[PDB]
């Protein structure tokens, strides 16, 4: 694997209920790869949210965590749909490729901040 994937933006701020979209970028020639989206737990566990393509051995996919390959093939939207305040945290992507050897590389981490919606002004 020539370079690790990139993950952007470094800080994403959204209002609760709205969608939050990161981009994981991974140059490839469509040779076998798996692209993983992770969120850090409060005990420093890397927890998998979604994969491209889907892990057929995992018990199922949370519908709010979506990965979409864009037309250039290198950029992947990683979207939190209907973001919650308790989605705020630390996110990253990682890639696995096999040629000429296997490598597993993670992106730099980014922060998601999901803010409280302001009420109508009384």
């Amino acid at each position, epitope marked *: 694997m020539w370079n690790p994937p990139t993950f952007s933006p470094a800080l994403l701020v959204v209002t609760e209920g709205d969608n939050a979209t990161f981009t994981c970028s991974f140059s490839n020639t469509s040779e076998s790869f798996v692209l993983n989206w992770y969120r850090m737990s409060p005990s420093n566990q890397t927890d998998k949210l979604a994969a491209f393509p889907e892990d*057929r051995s995992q018990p199922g996919q949370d519908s709010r965590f979506r990965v979409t390959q864009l037309p250039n093939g290198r950029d992947f939207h990683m979207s939190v749909v209907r973001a919650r305040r308790n989605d705020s945290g630390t996110y990253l992507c990682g890639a696995i490729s096999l040629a*000429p050897k296997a490598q597993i590389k993670e992106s730099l981490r980014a922060e998601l901040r999901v803010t409280e919606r302001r009420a109508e002004v009384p």
Partner: antibody
Amino acid sequence: EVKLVESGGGLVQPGGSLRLSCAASGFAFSSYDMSWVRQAPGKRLEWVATISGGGRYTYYPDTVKGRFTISRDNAKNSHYLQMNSLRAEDTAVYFCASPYGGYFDVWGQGTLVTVSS
Amino acid sequence: EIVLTQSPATLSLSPGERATLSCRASQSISNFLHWYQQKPGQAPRLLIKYASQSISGIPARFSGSGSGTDFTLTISSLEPEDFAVYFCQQSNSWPHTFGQGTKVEIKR
């Protein structure tokens, strides 16, 4: 729910040819690598071919290079192993399988190929 | 190619006993070492990926450990359903290769 089902195994004469097929269901077929892995009596499992999701990349060990060809028909949810110039040493159960980042997490049932005159 | 050597060839154990299965690679393969279970007439079933990560749904009694050349599958307490052949497989580099297997058979 995710399934692979092989067809095609049988008796082949030495120097002869055989084509195996594997039908997939329950997942997005064109998104995954497809493979064949064989198991000869008394011998370790031997990976013999992989094809990429879109069919553009193929990989083989030297033991079958020039004799075996892996192909796929994404519209038919199938892949194939064309096996030419077979020898006694190619007698084995042939499993279709699908790897995911290095390991095989979906397998078929195995189809026996027996090379004999 | 990378040659994987499993030992012992056969483990003879009773239900309830601990099974330790070794897989040694001919060169360093970092964590690119997977484990499978196989019974007669059946395809292999994946147990452990990337040396030490347990697949969803595998019983907690199975665990993989090791990095580099020396890898271990542990079955903490054998159930009857666990008497089978176990294989390791590397994906470090091409060709992907398998060990020759360890058979876990019943003591009597």
